[PDB]
Amino acid sequence: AIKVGAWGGNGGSAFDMGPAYRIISVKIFSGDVVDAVDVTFTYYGKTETRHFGGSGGTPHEIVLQEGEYLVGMKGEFGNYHGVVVVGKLGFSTNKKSYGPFGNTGGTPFSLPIAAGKISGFFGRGGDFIDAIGVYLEP
Amino acid sequence: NGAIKVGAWGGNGGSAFDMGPAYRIISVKIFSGDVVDAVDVTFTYYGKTETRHFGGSGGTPHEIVLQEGEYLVGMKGEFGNYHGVVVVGKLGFSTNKKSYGPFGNTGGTPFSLPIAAGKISGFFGRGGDFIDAIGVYLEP
Numbered sequence: 001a002i003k004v005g006a007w008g009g010n011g012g013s014a015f016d017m018g019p020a021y022r023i024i025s026v027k028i029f030s031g032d033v034v035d036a037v038d039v040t041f042t043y044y045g046k047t048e049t050r051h052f053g054g055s056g057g058t059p060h061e062i063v064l065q066e067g068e069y070l071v072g073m074k075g076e077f078g079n080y081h082g083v084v085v086v087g088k089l090g091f092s093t094n095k096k097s098y099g100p101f102g103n104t105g106g107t108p109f110s111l112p113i114a115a116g117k118i119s120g121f122f123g124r125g126g127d128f129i130d131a132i133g134v135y136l137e138p
Numbered sequence: 139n140g141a142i143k144v145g146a147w148g149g150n151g152g153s154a155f156d157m158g159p160a161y162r163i164i165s166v167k168i169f170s171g172d173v174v175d176a177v178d179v180t181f182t183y184y185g186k187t188e189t190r191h192f193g194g195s196g197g198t199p200h201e202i203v204l205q206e207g208e209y210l211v212g213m214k215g216e217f218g219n220y221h222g223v224v225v226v227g228k229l230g231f232s233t234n235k236k237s238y239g240p241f242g243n244t245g246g247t248p249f250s251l252p253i254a255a256g257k258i259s260g261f262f263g264r265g266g267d268f269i270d271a272i273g274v275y276l277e278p
């Protein structure tokens with residue numbers, strides 16, 4: 001019901017995991033660009049994992065503890081050899097800050113969440129994370 | 139009390155402001171010179187039509203009058219240093235009908251809030267002489 005962003009480019013193909021009950025972990029694969037994200041989450045009594053955007057890079061796992069929620073997403077998007085992709089990507093929880101991951105500067109974006117949380121993702125993916133957006137909940 | 143509050147984009151200067159969410163944003167008026175000086179918002183609180191005056195006195199007004207079917211589904215801008223203070227130097231909004239702005243002429247670190255689903259229902263931020271910062275309430 002509340003979907004924000006898609007920051008990135010038009011390349012790759014669409015993904016959309018919808019909202020979750022709880023995000024368990026977010027694993028950003030990155031080298032000089034953001035290659036991919038794995039999200040594992042619970043959904044109506046089940047645990048699920050998705051992986052958006054290609055093989056590539058080194059993994060950086062954010063694991064969410066008991067009362068921990070994603071309250072921020074930040075990054076940069078730009079042209080990496082002909083595709084507009086997320087060159088840098090970071091997250092913050094109520095407890096700590098992570099990243100950003102990736103080494104390619106571009107047009108910055110930032111989503112601080114003064115009230116609410118990130119409950120899921122949508123965007124575009126191919127060889128790399130072309131774009132990323134976020135579902136929000138109270 | 140989801141209010142879902144997104145942002146504050148800008149500096150830590152000035153005094154905090156927070157209008158809460160509205161039943162309906164009637165119009166948003168952005169005061170603008172080489173920086174964003176202020177925002178006035180006229181909206182319907184609980185039966186009543188109030189307006190709030192955020193930021194400072196300012197430069198030149200630019201009014202976005204929303205029409206019945208028209209909702210705010212986007213906010214973009216840039217924040218930067220302006221004589222020793224980090225303020226919003228550029229600010230723009232898009233609705234489901236039209237796109238307004240950006241207003242102001244001081245470039246800086248860009249931000250953007252495309253709302254693929256939902257809309258802006260209210261405003262908060264920081265204000266002094268200019269718009270130090272601005273954020274937004276979201277609802278479906």
Ligand SMILES: COC1O[C@H](CO)[C@@H](O)[C@H](O)[C@@H]1O
Nearest residue numbers: 030031058060100101102103
């Ligand atoms: C920003 O991109 C990287 O930085 C992280 C964090 O150190 C590394 O783990 C990763 O391999 C990349 O070199």
Ligand SMILES: CO[C@H]1O[C@H](CO)[C@@H](O)[C@H](O)[C@@H]1O
Nearest residue numbers: 011012083125126127128130
């Ligand atoms: C290299 O080819 C691809 O990978 C990039 C980056 O994800 C995409 O934008 C593109 O559409 C293809 O999927």
Ligand SMILES: CO[C@H]1O[C@H](CO)[C@@H](O)[C@H](O)[C@@H]1O
Nearest residue numbers: 030031032033034035056057
């Ligand atoms: C250029 O080499 C790298 O950067 C890319 C893009 O992020 C990764 O796929 C790869 O594993 C290396 O880290």
Ligand SMILES: CO[C@H]1O[C@H](CO)[C@@H](O)[C@H](O)[C@@H]1O
Nearest residue numbers: 151152223265266267268270
């Ligand atoms: C010039 O003095 C002030 O105006 C700026 C910009 O609004 C503020 O941060 C600051 O705290 C004071 O209120």
Ligand SMILES: CO[C@H]1O[C@H](CO)[C@@H](O)[C@H](O)[C@@H]1O
Nearest residue numbers: 170171172173174175196197
């Ligand atoms: C420097 O002159 C101006 O720019 C400032 C900041 O926007 C405004 O306060 C003033 O009204 C003029 O428009």
Ligand SMILES: [Zn+2]
Nearest residue numbers: 037038051052
């Ligand atoms: Zn994976």
Ligand SMILES: [Zn+2]
Nearest residue numbers: 058059060061
């Ligand atoms: Zn790591």
Ligand SMILES: [Zn+2]
Nearest residue numbers: 177178191192
């Ligand atoms: Zn006013």
